[PDB]
Amino acid sequence: SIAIPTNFTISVTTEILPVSMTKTSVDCTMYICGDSTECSNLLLQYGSF
Amino acid sequence: TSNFRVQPTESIVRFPNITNLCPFGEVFNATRFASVYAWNRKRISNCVA
């Protein structure tokens, strides 16, 4: 027993692929210390984090 | 390279236009002082300290 199609169909299926995220950057002293020169001295004591 | 932050131009200070002298002179130097358990809590307001 064999089943053979007679009339075909053509579909269009969408596909979703991310390619990139939102490019982001950050600065410690503005984030961590906030332009304060008292914290700017403390932060550098923690090495090159 | 780094973060550019515009240096502040000058310093601006604003305080309420009140110049009443606080009664601390007689509060600390009061003649009679209460006991430890019956401490007389005093509220000071509307005066420059």
Q: Are B48 and B33 in contact (CB under 8 A)?
A: no
Q: Are A33 and A43 in contact (CB under 8 A)?
A: yes
**Chain A CB within 8 Å of residue B9 CB:** no
**Chain A CB within 8 Å of residue B3 CB:** yes
**Chain A CB within 8 Å of residue B14 CB:** no
User: Resolution of this PDB entry, in A?
Assistant: 3.9
* Element of type H or E holding A41: helix A37-44
Measured CA distances, B14 to A24, A48, B11, B18 (Å): 38, 40, 10, 11
Q: How far apart are CA B24 and CA B28, in angstroms?
A: 6
Instruction: Tell me which residue has tokens 């600065």.
Output: A27
Which chain A residues have a beta carbon less than 8 Å from that of B5? 30, 35
Q: Are B44 and B23 in contact (CB under 8 A)?
A: yes
Which amino acid is present at B3?
Answer: N
**What are the structure tokens assigned to B13, written together?**
């200070």
Q: Are A29 and A43 in contact (CB under 8 A)?
A: yes
Instruction: Give me the DSSP letters along A1-40.
Output: ------S--------------------HHHHTT-S-HHHH
Pick the residue from chain A with its C-alpha nearest to B7. A35
